[PDB]
Structure formats: structure tokens, C-alpha cells
Design a protein around this ligand. Structure first.
Ligand code: HEM
Ligand SMILES: CC1=C(/C=C/C(C)=C/C=C/C(C)=C/C=O)C(C)(C)CCC1
Length: 445
């Protein structure tokens, strides 16, 4: 909840102030022009600062905590893997995995059982990202394994390291090392298997390269003639963490928000029934699911993942009107930017159509850095199309099949400090079926 007090301090003291706690301090930036200066116009004057001390233990030299030449080299190598053909193929994976979740919800609906949606969404996004990135099937939606428990142990340690530098106003360290070893060994097995597959395949590599039997990013990188084993594992681990935690929270907060506005749910149900019905969405459906897209856009506005971006000055600069030297630890409050009453009409209202339904999708450019769901400038998210489609698919397929409501007596929904916005106790919902089992599958065109 660290960003919550920063909001009211922003209202009183403005778009840049120094939050001091004893002999240390952070600069808190909530001004879109200043954010644009740091993230895009003058990014060369900034490092990821504290972000690296948080994530280094698991991401190593991966893209998110990296800076300098190793960042530039790996960025140029990895971005080509997320080409249009790859993203189009991942939409099939999104639908298959979302359908496996629907089967779980359908079983609960038939028994009248309530469901805790945050944990289910975490399993869904873990299953998707493991397959998309390095061709592994966690199947966390169905089972628990030592590999799955290792990932969540590592995730929890990353959460602990995120809260550690933040002011408030062994045996675990051995379990972490064991979990890291199991995941690294697991990745090593996949890398070895994939190299064998690359050596035996007959496919000329091109800019749209994709082996249809193994379309993972790991396979693209290996067939491209890419670096060391440590570096490749770090690259994969970074994308695993990034693509799991973010969308798990986006889906959680999207369905929380849906319970707050029945008229939005009605309009969403109308679109999904009309556009996809019971179908697995395709790439063509991504442009037609316009209201679903806006619901996702508005969820990311109200609950950004992460709610803050972290930088450190490595040179002199000017922020707003204020000169700074190198060494300033800076938190850009995406939360404040997204909820600023100066730049948003009825900023606290869940209103998917605050951007025209038939107009351009909102991004950091056309919102002039008052909206930054995927960051901006050279360090902008590389999975932004991937994740946007992933969440549209999950939302649409679930809303097609079920009605969701806050469960009676459910624990309150409150936020926590972390890399992403988790709830305190989950999102406990009742789930009822919208369609009949004996109805013929409906395929609209
Ligand atoms: C809703 C889902 C997601 C959200 C909200 C999100 C958000 C972000 C943000 C805000 C940044 C910029 C961080 C900074 O500037 O310090 C970022 C970077 C990054 N994200 Fe995403 N992300 C999502 C999903 C994904 C996925 C699915 C992948 C990979 C398949 C991914 C991989 C990355 C990588 C590698 C970077 C580092 C880029 C660089 O520094 O060159 N993310 N993400
Ligand atoms: C950059 C990045 C990530 C890490 C964020 C972290 C580590 C945030 C720390 C936030 C703090 C300290 C908030 C305090 O209120 C993710 C979510 C892994 C993936 C998407 C982009």
C-alpha cells in the first residue's frame, strides 16, 4: 500500500517532491511531463537503480534490471522473437489455457462452490507463460509440483525484496537457493532438448521464423544463432516473472472492477455473445473485441502493474524546474499518473469508454504519458501486444460462460505493497453458468 499515501502527498505537494526517511530519500514523480523526460526524452541519464538490487537474485542479467550494453544487446536479440506470427500463434495457447480454467469454473458452478479468483488467475498465467516462453507445461491449473512450488517460493522472495527498501509510516534463504536450483536445472533440460530439436530440424531462419512444433521464444532464440547458458536462463527467467505476475493481477483487478459496475458487465456480455460466442478467439477477434479491450485498458489504468517505476539518475538533469545531480533514487508513481484528477475525468470511476470505443487504443503516446500500463521510451515492455491479447482472451471467454459476483461473507478486497498489486486475502466470487451444457456450441461469424 506504499503508493496510497503518495497519492495524497502528490495532491498537496505536486508532481515532484522528496520523500525523506532519516538520512535517505526518494524523489516521487507524478507529473506526466517529468515522467516523459525520464522514461523517453532523456532516458540515457538514468539507470534502473534499486530495481536491480531487488530482482538481480532471480533475473540476473535479464532485460528488466539490466542497463548499458548488455541491455542493448539482449533487447535487440529478443524483440524479434515476438513477431506477429508468434503473437498470432500464442492466441491459440491463450484460448486453450483459458478454456482449461473455464472447465474448473464450470465444475465449481455446477456444485454451487465459491471460487478464489486471484489464485486461479495466477495458475492460468503461469501455465500460459511457461509454454509461450520455453515450451514447458507447468499445468499448475490442474496439479502441484516441486517446480511450481519453486516458482512461487522465488516469487515470494521477490516480493520480500520489493518491500525491503520501502519505508513504512537460513532456512528460508536455503529454500530459495534450492528453488532457484530446481528452476535453473529445469530450464537447462529444456534448453538441451530444444538445441537437439534445432539441430535436427530443416527450417531456414528468417525474420518471421517459427517452428510450428515448438513456437516458444526459447526456440526462436536458439534457431537464430544467438550467448552463455547463464545469460539465456536469465533472459527466460525475466520473461517468466514479467509475464506471470502482471497479468495475474490484471485479471484479478479486472474481475473485481466488473463486480462494481453491472452496466459494464452487461455491455461486455453483449459483445462477447455477439462476436465470439463459444469460440476460441483468433487474431481477427482482437480488433472486434473492442469493449473487452477497453475494459482491459481501464483496469490497467486503475490498477497498474507495477504501480511504480524505478530509476536512478546517473548524470545531472532538470526535473520540472528542479536541478538534480546523479545518484537520486526516483519513483515514478504510475498510480498517481493514472488517477490524477488533473488529467482524468471522474478518475476513480470504472469507465471503459472514457476512451472512444471506435477510436485509437490508449497508449503512453496518445495519452502523453498520463497512461503508462507498459512503460514508455527505450525500456518499454516488449510483451505489450502479447499481454494485451492474452488478457482480452481470458476476459472474453470467462464472461461468455459465467456470471461473477462478490461472494457473501467474502473477506474484504484490499491491496498490498509489492512488485504487483496483490490482494490481502483473495477475490472470493460466486460463479453461475450463463450457457446450458446441452446447448450446441455457438460459432458466430
Ligand atoms: C499485463 C501484462 C504486463 C504488464 C502490465 C507489463 C509491464 C511492464 C512495464 C511497465 C515495463 C517497464 C518497466 C520499466 O520501465 O522499468 C515492462 C518491461 C518488460 N516486460 Fe512487461 N509487462 C507485462 C507483460 C509482459 C510479458 C507477457 C512479457 C514477455 C513475454 C514481458 C516482458 C518484459 C520485459 C523483457 C521487459 C523489459 C524491457 C526492457 O527493459 O528492454 N512483460 N513490463
Ligand atoms: C519492472 C517490472 C516488474 C517489477 C517491478 C518491481 C520490482 C516493482 C517494485 C515496486 C515497489 C518497490 C513498489 C512500492 O510501492 C515486474 C512486475 C516483475 C514485471 C513488469 C515490469
Amino acid at each position: 500500500a506504499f503508493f496510497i499515501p503518495l497519492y495524497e502527498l502528490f495532491l498537496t505537494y505536486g508532481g515532484i517532491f522528496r520523500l525523506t526517511f532519516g538520512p535517505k530519500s526518494f524523489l516521487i514523480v507524478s507529473d506526466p511531463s517529468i515522467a516523459k523526460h525520464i522514461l523517453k526524452d532523456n532516458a540515457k541519464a538514468y539507470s534502473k537503480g534499486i530495481l536491480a538490487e531487488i530482482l538481480d537474485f532471480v533475473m540476473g542479467k535479464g532485460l528488466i534490471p539490466a542497463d548499458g550494453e548488455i541491455w542493448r544487446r539482449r533487447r535487440r536479440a529478443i524483440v524479434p522473437a515476438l513477431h506477429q506470427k508468434y503473437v498470432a500463434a500464442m492466441i491459440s495457447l491463450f484460448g486453450e489455457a483459458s478454456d482449461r480454467l473455464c472447465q474448473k469454473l464450470d465444475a465449481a458452478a455446477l456444485k454451487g462452490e465459491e471460487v478464489e479468483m486471484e489464485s486461479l488467475f495466477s495458475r492460468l498465467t503461469l501455465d500460459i507463460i511457461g509454454k509461450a516462453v520455453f515450451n514447458y507445461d507447468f499445468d499448475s491449473l490442474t496439479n502441484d509440483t516441486g517446480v511450481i512450488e519453486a516458482v512461487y517460493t522465488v516469487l515470494r522472495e521477490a516480493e520480500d525484496r520489493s518491500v525491503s527498501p520501502i519505508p513504512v509510516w537460513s532456512p528460508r534463504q536455503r529454500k530459495v537457493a534450492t528453488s532457484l536450483k530446481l528452476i535453473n536445472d529445469t530450464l537447462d533440460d529444456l534448453i538441451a532438448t530444444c538445441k537437439r530439436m534445432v539441430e535436427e530440424e530443416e527450417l531456414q531462419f528468417h525474420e518471421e521464423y517459427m517452428n510450428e512444433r515448438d513456437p516458444s521464444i526459447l526456440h526462436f532464440l536458439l534457431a537464430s544463432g544467438d550467448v552463455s547458458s547463464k545469460q539465456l536462463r536469465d533472459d527466460l527467467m525475466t520473461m517468466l516473472i514479467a509475464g506471470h505476475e502482471t497479468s495475474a493481477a490484471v485479471l484479478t483487478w479486472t474481475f473485481y472492477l466488473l463486480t462494481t459496475e453491472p452496466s459494464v458487465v452487461a455491455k461486455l456480455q453483449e459483445e462477447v455473445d455477439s462476436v465470439i460466442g463459444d469460440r476460441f478467439p483468433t487474431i481477427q477477434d482482437m480488433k472486434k473485441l473492442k469493449y473487452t479491450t477497453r475494459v482491459m485498458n481501464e483496469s490497467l489504468r486503475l490498477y497498474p502493474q507495477p504501480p511504480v517505476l524505478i530509476r536512478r539518475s546517473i548524470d545531472n538533469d532538470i526535473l520540472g524546474e528542479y536541478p538534480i545531480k546523479r545518484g537520486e533514487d526516483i519513483f515514478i508513481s504510475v498510480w498517481n499518473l493514472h488517477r490524477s484528477p488533473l488529467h482524468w475525468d471522474d478518475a476513480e470511476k470504472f469507465n471503459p469508454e472514457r476512451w472512444p470505443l471506435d477510436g485509437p487504443n490508449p497508449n503512453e503516446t496518445n495519452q502523453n504519458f498520463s497512461y503508462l500500463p507498459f512503460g514508455g521510451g527505450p525500456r518499454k515492455c516488449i510483451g505489450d501486444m502479447f499481454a494485451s491479447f492474452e488478457n482480452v482472451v481470458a476476459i472474453a471467454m470467462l464472461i461468455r460462460r459465467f456470471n461473477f459476483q462478490i461472494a457473501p461473507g467474502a473477506p474484504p478486497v484490499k491491496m498490498t505493497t509489492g512488485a504487483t498489486i496483490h490482494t490481502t486475502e483473495g477475490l472470493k466470487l460466486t460463479v453461475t453458468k450463463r450457457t446450458k451444457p446441452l446447448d450446441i456450441p455457438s460459432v458466430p461469424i
